[model samples]
Target chain A: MENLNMDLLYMAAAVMMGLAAIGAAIGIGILGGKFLEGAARQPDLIPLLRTQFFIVMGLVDAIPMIAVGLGLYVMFAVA
Target chain B: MENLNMDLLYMAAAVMMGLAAIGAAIGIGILGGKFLEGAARQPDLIPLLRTQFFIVMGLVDAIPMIAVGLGLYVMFAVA
Candidate 1:
């Protein structure tokens, strides 16, 4: 029973981190595509666009990062 | 089997937060792409676009934040 509990906890952590990875990857992928499109169109605006991209990327990953941290805690501390 | 139940509760919490992260990340990612596209087209509109982006980001994150809190409660308080 104890072993089962530990295994489930690990699975839980994996699910949390895995879903978070999917979301961050897709979100950043789309954002990057748009960035390239904008940069190609307006070469001079690269700096501004890059800045915005970075900022938005941060915003995009904020929650996923938290999820990752929580998953790590579960694996390292809780599980 | 008490430990088994506790572990399952942790799994439930992970599911809740993990899915929430996915939703928030994808939503913000798309929103950010729009913001960059707009900024690239109209450099002068960056300030306005940035403000709008921030506001929308908060909106996007609202529910996920709540889910994170709830998940935390489940893991720490309930489980």
Candidate 2:
């Protein structure tokens, strides 16, 4: 049981990282697409919307970055 | 099985790279498609939107970049 513990944790961390990475990528794809479409259509609102869009992009990325960090901690420290 | 553990880690790194690379490619495709569509609709907005799209693309790439970094770490440091 103890022997398997590190293996499981390592595998889980890797899995978690992959899952989060993909999820974040998909999310960015959808959000970025919509933002592009909107910006294209509304040139006047570009500057105003740009700041907010960047904020939202950061928000979207924050989740997966946290997940990756947690996974790395598990893999490198706990494992 | 310690030796096998290293093998598993290497294989897992490959899997991670595969998954991340695919996800990033798809995200880039979606973002680029939207960018192109937007540019087609409003050529005037190209310069402004181009900068914004690049920013968003960088955001979109962040997670995958981290994943790649972790994979490299596993390969060189952990393995």
Top TM-score: which candidate number?
A: 2
Residue range B1-79, candidate 1, lDDT tens digits: 6665666566666676666666666666566666656666665455556845653573467366546645663565553
RMSD of 2: 4.1
Q: Which residue pairs of candidate 1 clash?
A: none
| Candidate 1 steric clashes | 0
Q: What is the Cα-based lDDT of residue B26 in candidate 1?
A: 65
DockQ, all models: 0.59, 0.57
CAPRI-style class, candidate 1: medium
For residue B70, give model 1's deviation from the true position in Å: 6.3
- Model 2, position A74, has a per-residue lDDT of 53
Single out the weakest 10-residue window by summed lDDT for candidate 2 chain B.
Answer: B51-60
List A-chain TM-scores for all predictions: 0.53, 0.57
Top lDDT model: 1
